[PDB]
Design a protein around this ligand. Sequence first.
Ligand SMILES: C[N+](C)(C)CCCCCCCCCC[N+](C)(C)C
Ligand SMILES: C[N+](C)(C)CCCCCCCCCC[N+](C)(C)C
Lengths: 527, 527
Amino acid sequence: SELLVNTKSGKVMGTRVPVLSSHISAFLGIPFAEPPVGNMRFRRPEPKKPWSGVWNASTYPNNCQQYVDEQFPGFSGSEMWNPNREMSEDCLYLNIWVPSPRPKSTTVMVWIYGGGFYSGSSTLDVYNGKYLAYTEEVVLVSLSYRVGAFGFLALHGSQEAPGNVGLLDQRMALQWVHDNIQFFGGDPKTVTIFGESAGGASVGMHILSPGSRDLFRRAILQSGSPNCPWASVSVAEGRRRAVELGRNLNCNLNSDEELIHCLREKKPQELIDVEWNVLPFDSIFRFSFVPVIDGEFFPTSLESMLNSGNFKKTQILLGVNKDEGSFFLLYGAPGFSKDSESKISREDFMSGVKLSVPHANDLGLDAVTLQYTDWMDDNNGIKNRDGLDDIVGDHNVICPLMHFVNKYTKFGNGTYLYFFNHRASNLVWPEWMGVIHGYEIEFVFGLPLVKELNYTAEEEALSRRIMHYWATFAKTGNPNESKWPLFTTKEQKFIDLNTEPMKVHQRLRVQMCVFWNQFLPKLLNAT
Amino acid sequence: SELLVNTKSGKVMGTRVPVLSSHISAFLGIPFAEPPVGNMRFRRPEPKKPWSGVWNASTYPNNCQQYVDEQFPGFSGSEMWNPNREMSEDCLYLNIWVPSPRPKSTTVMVWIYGGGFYSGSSTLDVYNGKYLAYTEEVVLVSLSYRVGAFGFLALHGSQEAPGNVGLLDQRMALQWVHDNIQFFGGDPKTVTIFGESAGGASVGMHILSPGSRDLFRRAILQSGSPNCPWASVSVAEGRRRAVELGRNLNCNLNSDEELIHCLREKKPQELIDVEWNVLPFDSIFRFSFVPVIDGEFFPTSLESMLNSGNFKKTQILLGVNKDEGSFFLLYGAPGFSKDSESKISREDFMSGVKLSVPHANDLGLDAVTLQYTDWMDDNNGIKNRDGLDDIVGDHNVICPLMHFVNKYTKFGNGTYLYFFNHRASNLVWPEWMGVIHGYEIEFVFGLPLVKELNYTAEEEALSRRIMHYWATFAKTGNPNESKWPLFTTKEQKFIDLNTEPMKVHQRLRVQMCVFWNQFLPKLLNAT
Ligand SMILES: C[N+](C)(C)CCCCCCCCCC[N+](C)(C)C
Ligand SMILES: C[N+](C)(C)CCCCCCCCCC[N+](C)(C)C
């Protein structure tokens, strides 16, 4: 009946969820792989054997085991993104929000959430799919994927904990969407995978892996590229980090199989607890367990792939927002504090840049400084603050994205790039942080439609323009039905996406992105 | 009588020269050393044995042998600075312009002319001392010094052609000024040596050499520092260049004494002719025979001296003008032409920067480009033009000067720094060149007082403000009798010197001078 569909796995009973002045049918919690518990820890996802009877998809699923942030307890700003259902190793499920009436076959959008590859959840409130589904008539599915040690440990030649198992969890959720979205009214021939931060970086990874390209149509990447420094380690480094974690649990490190066993016997939180004492340096915006470029999955280095066009060739929509840096600076660079108007000193500035470009040599730090300091007022505390805010942002999201944009527009079927720079009116974070990495999401998912949560009317509107551009891109292959230009390697146009009449501009962070994407590398290459 | 003074060398008969509505006494051509002809070529200056009878100092002296510029014949812009009396190896003389009435004892200013150490003359019309002497009542002496191969050849251990003989010619003219200016009304206890380009760079050299410090009071350096890349070679390089020149004359290069002999037998123009085929690279703003840092004269590297305060400690007045680069670019960088509005291409730009930073490695050129290009419009022909104009200027005069300013203000008795940026109204050079290296001189020497040569009234005035600041500094030790701040290593003030109400500003070319004076060196040091 409307809330009871039959899929190749079995029947599933969903629910009606109100949305604005109406309803939608929601199927929360459909399983798609087997609970990777115990022995299966660190193994690739197995597909979920089909069921009898009707499965009750009316409750969001457990969240995955992950790091919970207690830096600013109760503060909604932090809590927003913390997991909200009990964490469980068993956590591989989907959530689908369909219209009522169930459409015949409509556009589908799959949201891969981000969170540095160490956290994240489907069930967050800011990832509530009902508003988008409802307003644009699309089906929306959110997926879960294993994050962290559990999702990205990577003892290379050991089939017991090869890398990227969490990446495959994404791919398996994509396949089930393919094979069964049809019974939900969706059109498998037009599914768009979207995602922010590590989700937007996972999205591009699937555009590059041979095996995933076929499972989706087009993609939308938000503040992420597969090539962002923090999203990938070499094989070696992944080994390196798993003996190091091996040591923080006092595991047997002889027989590699024993490493795997030892960890497979520790309880989840132990691993969560020592999860960060394994990184190799003092660094801000750098995470411990991430995708390894293993050869399988990613045939070869992403630079080669990018360089040769070896990747899916659809059109994409991607963008960056004004203050990417802030969050990391706040939570990790000395001098910054929520509550202060964090004017940095030149002392803490030079401390700051080291945390930001952790791999740079001294000469390299010199180059960075020279680029980001205002010599004409070399200690203006606030300028020092904002300058680090750009050093982290540029180096960690804007520049790697403009790289991917630039390489992929030579072989893809169209690129739409946005620059978001609106500060929501009801943000709880301090003004200095600006347009934080993460705050565009709430607009994309329609929370400014809910009156109860106090946004301003122009934000309601900005949220509608966005959701439209998004859904309209998700089918048409293009975002406008004024015209948002295509990005092109000549006069590289993009638009600002805010509450004022969109304006096309050209060459995003060009001067700085030359430094980061070309200069620095060549300098660190020499010496 | 007024035109016939008696000096420790003998008597000298000068002349009355009109100046404005009056006269002055002029003593042109007094000898101060022995004509360094033939056998004495390349030897140190001998002092001039005294004479009997009265010497007739009423005619300017011969000019020194040197390179004459025929790039734009007849064009006054070029011709201005070309030698105007027959060139002669015999060319060591002074010119003194005294008031009428002869003062008892007044301030003295000695003008050491510049010209890249390969050219220059006392007798130029733009170096006519009468207007300054007249208006400010100072005695003004101009000196000649041997330039070029003849002045700076440098077969290190050979007393027959040790280096810097031309530098010593300056010093000997300083001594005679010391010992005899008194009979001309000047006060030996208050002589200021001033000079532009290589003169302003020679001036600072004397502030550093042990032996010259005592011969003058204070100094004024215009577009020059002793430490400008082009003003000094190592001992080695000076050797290197003299065998190379040895070869262009097909000299015997075995016995070093034979090298010296061979050259001592070639006629002057042969040496002038091959004078440039000895430099070691393709470069703009770099000259062949220059001061060697030989240990004697300059005890040690100038960086040490600067670094330790080992130098005379008076107050100085120095400055730079807006478009230093232009002249060299015009005469030596591809794309530029008098007559064109020289918009450069990115092709000729990258050719340009190589000529400008001839010692840089590729990475280094990369660094320069990154700093001087507008990535947001990376091929705007005019921006490429002006950007090279700053690369040459900064690297060759502004930055080395701000270095010397900064080091010397920690131990000197006061520093007054100006930035000249007025375009004379009657300049003959094309507008693109702007405030050319060299054009402030005409203001300092009072040519805007002469109506016949068409300047505008505000320029007349600017010329008077200047001549005053200059003479007033030459006695007082300070330029103003509104107040032009002292330069200080904190809020490094300077003023613009132009036809509008002078404004103090701070930190001249600070962002760029960090790159050149600190960044680059460290990068070229690593690799
Ligand atoms: C990306 N979204 C917007 C979805 C969530 C980001 C939440 C704050 C991000 C910075 C904190 C990094 C913390 C790492 N530790 C706690 C280990 C310092
Ligand atoms: C400095 N002052 C203003 C006094 C005279 C400079 C005259 C033009 C300077 C640039 C030409 C360099 C030429 C070198 N060669 C001819 C060898 C290319």
